[PDB]
Amino acid sequence: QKGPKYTPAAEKPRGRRKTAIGYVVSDKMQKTIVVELEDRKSHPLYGKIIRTTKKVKAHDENGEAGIGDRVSLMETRPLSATKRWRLVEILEKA
Amino acid sequence: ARYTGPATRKSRRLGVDLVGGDQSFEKRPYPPGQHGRARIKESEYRQQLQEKQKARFSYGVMEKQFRRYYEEANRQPGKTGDNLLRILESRLDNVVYRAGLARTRRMARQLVSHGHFLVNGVKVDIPSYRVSQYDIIDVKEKSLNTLPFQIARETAGERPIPSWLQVVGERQRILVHQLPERAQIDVPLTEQLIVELYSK
Amino acid sequence: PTIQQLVRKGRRDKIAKVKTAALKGSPQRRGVCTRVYTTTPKKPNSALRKVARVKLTSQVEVTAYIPGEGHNLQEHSMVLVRGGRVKDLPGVRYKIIRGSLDTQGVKNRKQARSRYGAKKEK
Amino acid sequence: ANIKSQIKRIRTNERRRLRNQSVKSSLRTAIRGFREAVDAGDKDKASELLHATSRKLDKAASKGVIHPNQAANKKSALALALNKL
Amino acid sequence: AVKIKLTRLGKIRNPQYRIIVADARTRRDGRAIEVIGRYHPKEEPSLIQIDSERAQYWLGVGAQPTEPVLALLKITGDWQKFKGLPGAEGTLKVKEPKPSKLDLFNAALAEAE
RNA sequence: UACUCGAGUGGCGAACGGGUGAGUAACACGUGGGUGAUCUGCCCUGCACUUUGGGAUAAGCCUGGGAAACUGGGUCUAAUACCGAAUACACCCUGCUGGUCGCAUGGCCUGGUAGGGGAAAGCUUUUGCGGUGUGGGAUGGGCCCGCGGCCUAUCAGCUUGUUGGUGGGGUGAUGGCCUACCAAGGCGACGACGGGUAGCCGGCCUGAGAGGGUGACCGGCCACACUGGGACUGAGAUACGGCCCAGACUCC
């Protein structure tokens, strides 16, 4: 009456990473684009909604997205410093 | 602590005679001091303070405790005033006074503090003991034959009994139906000016 | 103002002026009376108000009133300085309190003895 | 020091330090030999030194001088260098 | 080491413990992974409330209890439910509920004759 | 001798617990997430084993040096100390290859296949203790990120490993973390860079509330241990009561 030679691990569901739709504002680095993000939230006190403009740096690996392109990004691990996003697809290339 | 000073003069300062049996105030009407019969500026603060002190010195409660009673009443629901009166009446000195065993809240306080009572079996040396619904307040075995309780059972027809209370035995056991409502309280005082005071 | 004016520039409360800076957050301080003397108050009042220039432990030299009838204070006296405004004396915000290991209580105070360092006599 | 256990642990830690020192130094020597064989261009010598060095890295990881993941990364680098040679 | 412990709570001479599970490297009054019981040994029956299912989980995954809480598990049968020696004892005794104040009130009313 | 045990070897602990808030305006904290980018002693549970051989040394004995701290030598002794080898085919690496998931690198099927490899410790008679590898779990962490919480522009330009990439190195792990080369970018009025202040939070005080102020006890996280720097050991180190160096101070 032996137990299993091998016990499988559990089927831990894969975590959901963050997804960001943005606009490119630089492509002058190799395999790296900079992207603007528009996050709108209410002021903590006055209640007005503040359109905040945030920059992030992402990875494309092929150099197809240029300035003015609406894109979609998925968070990743550090691929460099300052760089925790991967490109997914381009949406409104211009 | 407690106020072990003269009793009539507080009632005189506050108009209402809480106990009675003097002639100075009762012939000449005035608060104590040489400056009785003086001119008064009729301030709402004096009105309010006077009701607060009426309560304090009718019972044997000091301000740092009356403040806590007020705060309990204000937190817990209903009208803060009648909740406060319910609290001040739901304490051991007052229930035995209202039951007539002492005919003075000072005497009731001395009795409870000296331990001539107990509640549901356990001795109580706390006049501030907040009694509750369905509380048997027994007297101990020395105390029932002592002179003050002899006087109680002898003269237990002078002042009435509240409804929420009743004495049940010749041994002067006391029972609590519920806690009193503002009709059950029967005290010569309002209760709104005090909460106004502590809301200032 | 407008809400955007507020989210940009915001509200800034008027800066409360630090007071009794010579104490440096303390309720009291110890100091040597560098010069005990007397000052003349403002115009409506007239009196010979007793004061001392005291060099505190905060490395600050300030003027300090000496309440009460009498005072035994000379220079080089260790004194305990509290706060308290004396209106008629313009340039002073500190007082001296008895029971300072030099400033004994006032003589024959019998009403407000606690404010003048006087022991009960019985 | 001023405690018996630390006074002893000083000696023990120095002992373990000397051990791990000898082991890691042997490893780095094996790797420099392998990398010399590779940058020179020899292949079968490089494969033999690779087997020997991988063996020693597994051995050190089992002794606890290094982590098995570290041994893995080292020998993987060696194998890939040999392959791309 | 994960361990079942007694966190002291309560005032000075009233050691009301709370039966937790926590690492051994924590401190007594520290952060607890989970609370599974309570232990008030000032009652004469010295209350032993517990949560059996979570106790069994933590024992199955290998939480070494302390000695007192081991005795408590032996009392509640969870130790025995875990190992399986006498099945599950169930040695626990509780404080009998004293009579209701309403019942005392009505009894004294009846005596008021 | 072997109950008992100084000292000693060895194991485990010593990284917890306890203290302070100097530093820190930062992923330090709080909160929420990610880790297909990761470690995890002890503990629990499965699988497979625990084979074989050897060389020393502390201690002890004989000495030497030194004022002391301490230390050199010779000789001698054992082990769960140390070291080789065998086996492991669960594990590690590489090559080829299939399916599947896909959130892209890639992950899962202990995929398959070929090659080359990886270990162990014995003790005691008693409610017996252990050891190794491996799978899983639990716990404890690490790293990354969103958002949030001070003053200051009478501090406007800052950055050159700085932004990115390739190949290597390094790590437990991703990554300029490090390096050679390459490209010249990256951050800034939404306040960069500076200056000042300050441990953060749950909470506490006030207040009708919003808010303001605060961060004492208690509890959590961080940081630090004479100052500064550094690593070693180890599962794990800011290593308070550990090591090395330098410095100040105190003492022989």
Tab-separated table of N, CA and C in Angstrom, chain D residues 2-82:
chain	number	residue	atom	x	y	z
D	2	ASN	N	32.555	37.915	24.109
D	2	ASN	CA	32.293	37.758	25.533
D	2	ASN	C	31.245	36.692	25.824
D	3	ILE	N	30.975	35.797	24.880
D	3	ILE	CA	30.082	34.668	25.097
D	3	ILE	C	30.728	33.413	24.532
D	4	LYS	N	30.562	32.317	25.267
D	4	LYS	CA	31.189	31.046	24.942
D	4	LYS	C	30.774	30.547	23.569
D	5	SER	N	29.482	30.630	23.266
D	5	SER	CA	28.982	30.091	22.013
D	5	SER	C	29.547	30.850	20.829
D	6	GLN	N	29.671	32.167	20.948
D	6	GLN	CA	30.261	32.941	19.867
D	6	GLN	C	31.747	32.676	19.764
D	7	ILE	N	32.405	32.494	20.901
D	7	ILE	CA	33.830	32.203	20.898
D	7	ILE	C	34.100	30.904	20.157
D	8	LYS	N	33.213	29.929	20.310
D	8	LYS	CA	33.349	28.683	19.569
D	8	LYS	C	32.957	28.863	18.110
D	9	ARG	N	31.881	29.607	17.868
D	9	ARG	CA	31.385	29.784	16.517
D	9	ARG	C	32.376	30.543	15.660
D	10	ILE	N	33.236	31.344	16.276
D	10	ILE	CA	34.319	31.984	15.541
D	10	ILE	C	35.192	30.928	14.886
D	11	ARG	N	35.627	29.954	15.680
D	11	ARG	CA	36.471	28.889	15.167
D	11	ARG	C	35.742	28.078	14.114
D	12	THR	N	34.485	27.736	14.388
D	12	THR	CA	33.732	26.920	13.443
D	12	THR	C	33.560	27.649	12.122
D	13	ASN	N	33.185	28.922	12.188
D	13	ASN	CA	32.951	29.699	10.988
D	13	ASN	C	34.227	29.880	10.195
D	14	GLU	N	35.362	30.049	10.869
D	14	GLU	CA	36.621	30.113	10.142
D	14	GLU	C	36.910	28.798	9.437
D	15	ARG	N	36.628	27.683	10.106
D	15	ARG	CA	36.811	26.372	9.498
D	15	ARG	C	35.976	26.233	8.233
D	16	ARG	N	34.690	26.544	8.344
D	16	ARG	CA	33.794	26.433	7.203
D	16	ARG	C	34.187	27.404	6.109
D	17	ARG	N	34.710	28.563	6.492
D	17	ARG	CA	35.173	29.537	5.521
D	17	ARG	C	36.326	28.979	4.718
D	18	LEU	N	37.286	28.359	5.397
D	18	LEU	CA	38.420	27.771	4.702
D	18	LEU	C	37.971	26.675	3.752
D	19	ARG	N	37.053	25.828	4.210
D	19	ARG	CA	36.509	24.775	3.363
D	19	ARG	C	35.875	25.350	2.105
D	20	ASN	N	34.914	26.252	2.288
D	20	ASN	CA	34.196	26.824	1.163
D	20	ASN	C	35.126	27.603	0.257
D	21	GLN	N	36.163	28.203	0.830
D	21	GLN	CA	37.157	28.920	0.054
D	21	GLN	C	37.876	27.982	-0.889
D	22	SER	N	38.404	26.884	-0.348
D	22	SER	CA	39.074	25.889	-1.173
D	22	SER	C	38.163	25.394	-2.282
D	23	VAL	N	36.906	25.134	-1.947
D	23	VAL	CA	35.989	24.548	-2.914
D	23	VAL	C	35.693	25.532	-4.034
D	24	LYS	N	35.276	26.743	-3.674
D	24	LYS	CA	34.964	27.746	-4.676
D	24	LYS	C	36.175	28.066	-5.532
D	25	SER	N	37.360	28.124	-4.929
D	25	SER	CA	38.559	28.399	-5.702
D	25	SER	C	38.826	27.300	-6.711
D	26	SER	N	38.659	26.044	-6.299
D	26	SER	CA	38.789	24.941	-7.239
D	26	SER	C	37.799	25.086	-8.379
D	27	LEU	N	36.590	25.534	-8.064
D	27	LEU	CA	35.562	25.684	-9.085
D	27	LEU	C	35.936	26.758	-10.088
D	28	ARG	N	36.354	27.913	-9.587
D	28	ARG	CA	36.744	29.004	-10.464
D	28	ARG	C	37.952	28.617	-11.297
D	29	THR	N	38.835	27.792	-10.740
D	29	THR	CA	39.973	27.296	-11.498
D	29	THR	C	39.519	26.379	-12.626
D	30	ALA	N	38.578	25.490	-12.330
D	30	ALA	CA	38.042	24.621	-13.364
D	30	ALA	C	37.377	25.424	-14.465
D	31	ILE	N	36.659	26.476	-14.090
D	31	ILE	CA	35.948	27.265	-15.082
D	31	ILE	C	36.921	28.070	-15.925
D	32	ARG	N	37.978	28.606	-15.318
D	32	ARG	CA	38.942	29.333	-16.129
D	32	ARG	C	39.661	28.387	-17.074
D	33	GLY	N	39.926	27.158	-16.635
D	33	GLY	CA	40.510	26.182	-17.538
D	33	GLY	C	39.596	25.864	-18.703
D	34	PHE	N	38.314	25.654	-18.411
D	34	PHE	CA	37.340	25.403	-19.464
D	34	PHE	C	37.276	26.561	-20.444
D	35	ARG	N	37.216	27.782	-19.927
D	35	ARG	CA	37.076	28.942	-20.787
D	35	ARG	C	38.344	29.186	-21.587
D	36	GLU	N	39.497	28.791	-21.051
D	36	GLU	CA	40.721	28.807	-21.837
D	36	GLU	C	40.644	27.804	-22.973
D	37	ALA	N	40.142	26.606	-22.685
D	37	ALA	CA	40.010	25.597	-23.725
D	37	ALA	C	39.061	26.056	-24.811
D	38	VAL	N	38.043	26.817	-24.434
D	38	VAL	CA	37.052	27.269	-25.398
D	38	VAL	C	37.593	28.426	-26.225
D	39	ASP	N	38.093	29.474	-25.569
D	39	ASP	CA	38.588	30.624	-26.309
D	39	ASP	C	39.808	30.279	-27.149
D	40	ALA	N	40.570	29.259	-26.754
D	40	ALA	CA	41.589	28.725	-27.646
D	40	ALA	C	40.944	28.013	-28.823
D	41	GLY	N	39.907	27.228	-28.551
D	41	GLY	CA	39.106	26.582	-29.572
D	41	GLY	C	39.030	25.079	-29.459
D	42	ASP	N	39.783	24.456	-28.555
D	42	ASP	CA	39.689	23.015	-28.376
D	42	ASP	C	38.277	22.626	-27.964
D	43	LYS	N	37.834	21.471	-28.452
D	43	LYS	CA	36.458	21.020	-28.312
D	43	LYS	C	36.316	19.806	-27.412
D	44	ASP	N	37.058	18.733	-27.679
D	44	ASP	CA	36.926	17.538	-26.855
D	44	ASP	C	37.514	17.764	-25.471
D	45	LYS	N	38.635	18.482	-25.401
D	45	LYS	CA	39.167	18.900	-24.114
D	45	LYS	C	38.148	19.737	-23.364
D	46	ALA	N	37.482	20.642	-24.077
D	46	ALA	CA	36.472	21.480	-23.455
D	46	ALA	C	35.312	20.651	-22.932
D	47	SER	N	34.913	19.618	-23.671
D	47	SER	CA	33.815	18.771	-23.226
D	47	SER	C	34.203	17.987	-21.985
D	48	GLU	N	35.444	17.516	-21.939
D	48	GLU	CA	35.895	16.762	-20.780
D	48	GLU	C	35.953	17.655	-19.552
D	49	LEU	N	36.533	18.842	-19.711
D	49	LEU	CA	36.561	19.800	-18.619
D	49	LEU	C	35.161	20.225	-18.226
D	50	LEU	N	34.231	20.239	-19.174
D	50	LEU	CA	32.857	20.589	-18.855
D	50	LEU	C	32.231	19.538	-17.965
D	51	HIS	N	32.431	18.270	-18.305
D	51	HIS	CA	31.903	17.201	-17.471
D	51	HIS	C	32.497	17.274	-16.075
D	52	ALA	N	33.811	17.484	-15.997
D	52	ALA	CA	34.474	17.558	-14.703
D	52	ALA	C	33.971	18.738	-13.883
D	53	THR	N	33.805	19.888	-14.524
D	53	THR	CA	33.420	21.089	-13.808
D	53	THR	C	31.963	21.033	-13.392
D	54	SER	N	31.105	20.472	-14.237
D	54	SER	CA	29.720	20.262	-13.852
D	54	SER	C	29.628	19.317	-12.673
D	55	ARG	N	30.440	18.262	-12.689
D	55	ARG	CA	30.491	17.348	-11.563
D	55	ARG	C	30.876	18.085	-10.290
D	56	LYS	N	31.910	18.916	-10.368
D	56	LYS	CA	32.356	19.637	-9.184
D	56	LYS	C	31.333	20.666	-8.726
D	57	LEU	N	30.578	21.248	-9.651
D	57	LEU	CA	29.562	22.216	-9.262
D	57	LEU	C	28.392	21.537	-8.572
D	58	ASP	N	27.926	20.412	-9.121
D	58	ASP	CA	26.937	19.601	-8.421
D	58	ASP	C	27.433	19.219	-7.039
D	59	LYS	N	28.707	18.860	-6.948
D	59	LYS	CA	29.277	18.423	-5.687
D	59	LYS	C	29.275	19.547	-4.663
D	60	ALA	N	29.691	20.738	-5.077
D	60	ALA	CA	29.705	21.874	-4.172
D	60	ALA	C	28.299	22.253	-3.747
D	61	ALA	N	27.342	22.168	-4.667
D	61	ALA	CA	25.964	22.462	-4.308
D	61	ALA	C	25.439	21.464	-3.292
D	62	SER	N	25.856	20.207	-3.405
D	62	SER	CA	25.424	19.206	-2.441
D	62	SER	C	26.076	19.443	-1.090
D	63	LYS	N	27.324	19.899	-1.096
D	63	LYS	CA	27.992	20.262	0.143
D	63	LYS	C	27.407	21.512	0.778
D	64	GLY	N	26.761	22.366	-0.006
D	64	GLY	CA	26.186	23.593	0.491
D	64	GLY	C	27.051	24.810	0.301
D	65	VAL	N	28.208	24.662	-0.338
D	65	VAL	CA	29.052	25.811	-0.634
D	65	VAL	C	28.318	26.789	-1.533
D	66	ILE	N	27.496	26.274	-2.440
D	66	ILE	CA	26.733	27.086	-3.364
D	66	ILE	C	25.320	26.539	-3.434
D	67	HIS	N	24.519	27.257	-4.008
D	67	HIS	CA	23.151	26.853	-4.225
D	67	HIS	C	23.042	26.007	-5.491
D	68	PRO	N	22.111	25.050	-5.535
D	68	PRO	CA	21.956	24.270	-6.763
D	68	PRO	C	21.581	25.111	-7.953
D	69	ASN	N	20.822	26.181	-7.740
D	69	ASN	CA	20.460	27.063	-8.837
D	69	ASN	C	21.689	27.755	-9.396
D	70	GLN	N	22.615	28.123	-8.520
D	70	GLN	CA	23.853	28.732	-8.971
D	70	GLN	C	24.667	27.747	-9.784
D	71	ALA	N	24.776	26.514	-9.293
D	71	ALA	CA	25.484	25.487	-10.042
D	71	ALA	C	24.854	25.282	-11.406
D	72	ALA	N	23.527	25.277	-11.444
D	72	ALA	CA	22.796	25.115	-12.686
D	72	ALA	C	23.138	26.215	-13.666
D	73	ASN	N	23.134	27.457	-13.197
D	73	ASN	CA	23.407	28.574	-14.089
D	73	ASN	C	24.822	28.499	-14.630
D	74	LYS	N	25.780	28.162	-13.766
D	74	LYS	CA	27.164	28.059	-14.205
D	74	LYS	C	27.314	26.995	-15.280
D	75	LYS	N	26.855	25.778	-14.993
D	75	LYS	CA	27.067	24.692	-15.935
D	75	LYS	C	26.262	24.890	-17.204
D	76	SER	N	25.098	25.521	-17.102
D	76	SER	CA	24.329	25.835	-18.290
D	76	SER	C	25.100	26.785	-19.179
D	77	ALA	N	25.725	27.790	-18.577
D	77	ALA	CA	26.549	28.703	-19.348
D	77	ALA	C	27.688	27.965	-20.029
D	78	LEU	N	28.319	27.040	-19.310
D	78	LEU	CA	29.400	26.253	-19.897
D	78	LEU	C	28.911	25.444	-21.087
D	79	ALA	N	27.805	24.728	-20.904
D	79	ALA	CA	27.265	23.892	-21.962
D	79	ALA	C	26.910	24.712	-23.187
D	80	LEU	N	26.295	25.872	-22.987
D	80	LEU	CA	25.901	26.688	-24.124
D	80	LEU	C	27.116	27.265	-24.829
D	81	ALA	N	28.157	27.605	-24.073
D	81	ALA	CA	29.391	28.067	-24.690
D	81	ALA	C	29.994	26.975	-25.557
D	82	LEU	N	30.028	25.758	-25.029
D	82	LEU	CA	30.563	24.631	-25.777
D	82	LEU	C	29.745	24.363	-27.029
